[PDB]
Amino acid sequence: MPQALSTDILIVGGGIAGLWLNARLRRAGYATVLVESASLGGGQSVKSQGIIHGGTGASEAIADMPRRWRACLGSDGELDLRGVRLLSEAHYLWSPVEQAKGEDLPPALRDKGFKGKAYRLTEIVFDVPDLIRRLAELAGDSLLAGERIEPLREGRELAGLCVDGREIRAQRVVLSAGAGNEALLRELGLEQPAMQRRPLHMVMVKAATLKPLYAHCLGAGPKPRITVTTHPTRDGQSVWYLGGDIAETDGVARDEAAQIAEARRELAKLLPWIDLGQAQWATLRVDRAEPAQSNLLRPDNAFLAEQGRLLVGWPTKLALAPDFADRVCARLEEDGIRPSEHAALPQLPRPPLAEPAWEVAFA
Ligand SMILES: Cc1cc2nc3c(=O)[nH]c(=O)nc-3n(C[C@H](O)[C@H](O)[C@H](O)COP(=O)(O)OP(=O)(O)OC[C@H]3O[C@@H](n4cnc5c(N)ncnc54)[C@H](O)[C@@H]3O)c2cc1C
Ligand SMILES: [Hg+2]
């Protein structure tokens, strides 16, 4: 028998949404346990491009995100993320806000061959592994590696969970397990809220010759043709990580070589002044985990649902993790749930941190 535990809020899943919420709750005086079955940040989060989007009824929530995340890096934000690494102070639009010129242009667009125009946004780009590291620090002793989860009932009521045979009692249980939310819901005998999986086929290029770039390339059409972010590697090279429309439906249908070949064509057109002849190339397939369209959604918002003492959801964007936290805290607030008194947590087995794919795919 492992030592039984007691807290206020028990969170399942240590990606950005669970970790951010955990940090908010602890800051507000709640006791928590956060349960992760693999590595923290290791589903979608560390695989994101790290861009904090900010672009109004439903669309209000997203618009305020860059300001909110920025605040956290200083003295007066909703979390203490001071000393978290930004990859870039700005993300850019790139066409054929501020119009950027001369040495205000991103390094990769300073070339004389750069025709067309770039626009600087308030949007920010975070080093996600370093973000996750800090949120794990803010978690303190709440963090628990646990693989196998069962419900802990009191009649029909959900009193907590049994994690690797350990009973953990809690006033609420929150499922922030990404793609794992579906099977956890089934484990509780639930089928709502339903989940969808929208795959991406992301491309990574690694070379010594790359110059920093954080941008959506627009042709015609609302959506980015490609989305570039630059990621430094431990050995002193960089990696350009490519999302956008190249990583969507037709990218998904292309195999690795066809997807790489498509990526080479497009970089030769858009950034011909950067020699990729010595570059290494890889791709990455990953599913976005979202509420199904069959749920009651507001689009540019986090999604949350509940059944009894169970709260469950998805941020939809990494950007919107603070909105996911707000939605949980307003339920707690409306329901009158306050911090109670609990024994200190013992020593617990701790989940590992995830590495970014650019360190694993080449190194
Ligand atoms: C390629 C890509 C690029 C993206 N780029 C951006 C971007 O630039 N900007 C932006 O705002 N958003 C972006 N997103 C969206 C963003 O990544 C997600 O919305 C967000 O990271 C999801 O956070 P999460 O914590 O809900 O999910 P996850 O990060 O998937 O975390 C879920 C966690 O739960 C754990 N878990 C699963 N099952 C169980 C279980 N049974 N028991 C215990 N733990 C479990 C997992 O191991 C995982 O760590 C991107 C997504 C992808 C796929
Ligand atoms: Hg472009």
Author numbering: 1 to 55, 65 to 105, 125 to 391
What does the primary publication say about this deposited structure?
Locus PA4991 had been annotated to encode a flavin-binding protein of 391 amino acids. Analysis of the structure of PA4991 identifies this enzyme as a member of the GR2 family of flavoenzymes. The function of this essential enzyme in the virulence and survival of P. aeruginosa in the host nevertheless remains elusive.
The structure of PA4991 was eventually solved by a combination of molecular replacement using a truncated search model generated from the sequence of PA4991 with Rosetta and phase improvement using a low-occupancy heavy-metal derivative obtained by soaking crystals with phenylmercuric chloride. The refined model of PA4991 consists of one polypeptide chain comprising residues 1–391, one FAD molecule, 41 water molecules and two Hg2+ ions bound on opposite sides of the thiol group of Cys245, albeit with low occupancy. Three loop regions, residues 55–67, 106–125 and 248–249, lacked electron density and appeared to be disordered in the crystal, and therefore were not modelled. FAD is bound noncovalently to PA4991 in an extended conformation in a manner similar to that observed in other members of the GR2 family. The ADP moiety of FAD binds to the classic nucleotide-binding fold, including the diphosphate-binding fingerprint motif GxGxxG, which in PA4991 is represented by the sequence Gly13-Gly14-Gly15-Ile16-Ala17-Gly18 at the end of strand β2 in the central β-sheet of the domain. The isoalloxazine ring is located in an accessible pocket with the re face of FAD facing the solvent. Accessibility of the cofactor in PA4991 appears in part to be controlled by the loop comprising residues 54–67, which is disordered in PA4991. In the vicinity of the isoalloxazine ring there are the side chains of His53, Arg316 and Lys345 that potentially could be involved in ligand binding and/or catalysis. Enzymatic assays did not support a function as a G3P dehydrogenase/oxidase or an amino-acid oxidase as hypothesized based on the three-dimensional structure. The conservation of the active-site arginine residue involved in the binding of negatively charged groups of the substrate in these enzymes suggests that the unknown substrate of PA4991 might also carry a negatively charged phosphate or carboxyl group.
